[PDB]
Amino acid sequence: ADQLLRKKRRIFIHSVGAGTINALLDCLLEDEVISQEDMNKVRDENDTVMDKARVLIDLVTGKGPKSCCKFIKHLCEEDPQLASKMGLH
């Protein structure tokens, strides 16, 4: 009963703008949910957003559903448009 990202993996990934990503991953660090190890994963910059997203959305969920909370929240303030399909409440 906790796999929002998973199902919504096709949405966030095929929508999130290269911009929000920079502002999103930045917020994560603030909470210190990730680690210099993961932070490096994304920084590596693979290719098109489709790639930089798949890793960002994944790395989060990896840290358990406890992160999903701050994620959906930070995203709401960063993007109210996309957050629409993720603005459950």
Buried b (16+ CB within 10 A) or exposed e, 31-50: eebbeeebeeebeeeeeebe
The domain 1-89: what is its CATH number?
Answer: 1.10.533.10
Approach to solving: NMR
| Residues whose CB is less than 8 angstroms from the CB of residue 4 and which lie 6 or more positions away in sequence, other chains included | 65, 68, 72, 86
